[PDB]
């Protein structure tokens, strides 16, 4: 009292609106710029969320910043996948209630390849019939799934918090009223979905960096994302970012 899962439910960020103006036809530039502004605001909410996670603030501040800096795209894409799963059963990308991207609007320059990759995340929720509590536990593990190759400043704390939420995901599984063999296979399928996020998010990040560095595209980024992207960029090309996999 209170259960950990009940706390994750109450700290989940509320969905934000985009204010997108659909009066006139869409353009790839106006759409990407609107999404980045929305993305910057969702990341601010994600920081508020992470600070309320039990155990997170026991980490060194530099580690709190590293984890959020390394995993923000995977958090946003995983939440987009969930919203799209509940709204359209994975048929459309529900970036926001006032900005839904169906198969038509994806037929824009720079949009199609990345939007298809994000539809694939939503379709995994459909195939596996993920529950809300399973989703909340998996989303915490994403925050704890990408670390520096040289380790964190408080590795001991990090290792224990990560196991705390691995166990919590198990509790969410057991709630489905399955036997031991079923619960282990369920856990296997969900830890495989988490591992696949690293590759599916890789292409999203590679393209985010592309639109950020090439100013010719006229794509606008909020200061929140600009600061994170520019600081995150030299670490990736240097190969100092290692994902944490359940399966090798």
């Amino acid at each position: 009292a209170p259960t950990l899962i009940s706390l994750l439910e109450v700290i989940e960020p509320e969905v934000l609106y985009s204010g997108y103006d659909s009066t006139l036809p869409d353009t790839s530039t106006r759409l990407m710029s609107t999404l980045n502004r929305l993305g910057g605001r969702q990341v601010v909410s994600a920081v508020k969320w992470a600070k309320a996670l039990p155990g997170f603030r026991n980490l060194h501040l530099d580690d709190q910043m590293t984890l959020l800096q390394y995993s923000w795209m995977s958090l946003m894409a995983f939440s987009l996948g969930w919203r799209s799963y509940k709204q359209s059963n994975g048929n459309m990308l529900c970036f926001a209630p006032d900005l839904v991207i169906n198969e038509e609007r994806m037929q824009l320059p720079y949009m199609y390849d990345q939007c298809q990759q994000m539809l694939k995340i939503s379709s995994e929720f459909v195939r596996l019939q993920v529950s809300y509590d399973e989703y909340l536990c998996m989303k915490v593990l994403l925050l704890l799934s990408t670390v520096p190759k040289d380790g964190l400043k408080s590795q001991a704390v990090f290792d224990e918090i990560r196991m705390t939420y691995i166990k919590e995901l198990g509790k969410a599984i057991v709630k489905r009223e399955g036997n031991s063999s079923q619960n282990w296979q369920r856990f296997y399928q969900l830890t495989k979905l988490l591992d696949s996020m690293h590759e599916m998010v890789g292409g999203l990040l590679q393209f985010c960096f592309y639109t950020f560095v090439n100013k010719s595209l006229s794509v606008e980024f909020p200061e929140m994302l600009a600061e994170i992207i520019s600081n995150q960029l030299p670490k990736f090309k240097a190969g100092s970012v290692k994902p944490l996999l359940f399966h090798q």
Binding site: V44, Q64, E223, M224, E227, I228
Partner: peptide, 11 residues
């Protein structure tokens, strides 16, 4: 370090 992110985490 990204200033806005750090400002959020240190309150």
């Amino acid at each position: 370090a990204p200033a806005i992110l750090y400002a959020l985490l240190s309150s």
